[PDB]
């Protein structure tokens, strides 16, 4: 599996990796921060019984 470093230049696979992880981490944090259930900056101190849960309309 170490032959990866013969196929590809490790100096720049590793830049691509760190770039990919940084983008991915930021996307996930901004997604969660957009949600209602996981807006931790404003509702982070609520316990799970208080935390929002999304549902569809009751469809009576």
């Amino acid at each position: 599996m170490h032959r990866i470093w013969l196929m590809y230049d490790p100096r720049r696979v590793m830049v691509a990796l760190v770039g990919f992880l940084a983008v991915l981490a930021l996307v996930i944090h901004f997604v969660l921060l957009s949600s209602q259930r996981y807006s931790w900056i404003e509702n982070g101190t609520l316990g799970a019984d208080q935390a929002p849960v999304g549902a569809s309309a009751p469809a009576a």
């Binding site: 549902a55 309309a57 009751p58 469809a59 009576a60």
Partner: peptide, 4 residues
């Protein structure tokens, strides 16, 4: 029907 506004809520469950």
């Amino acid at each position: 029907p506004t809520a469950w």
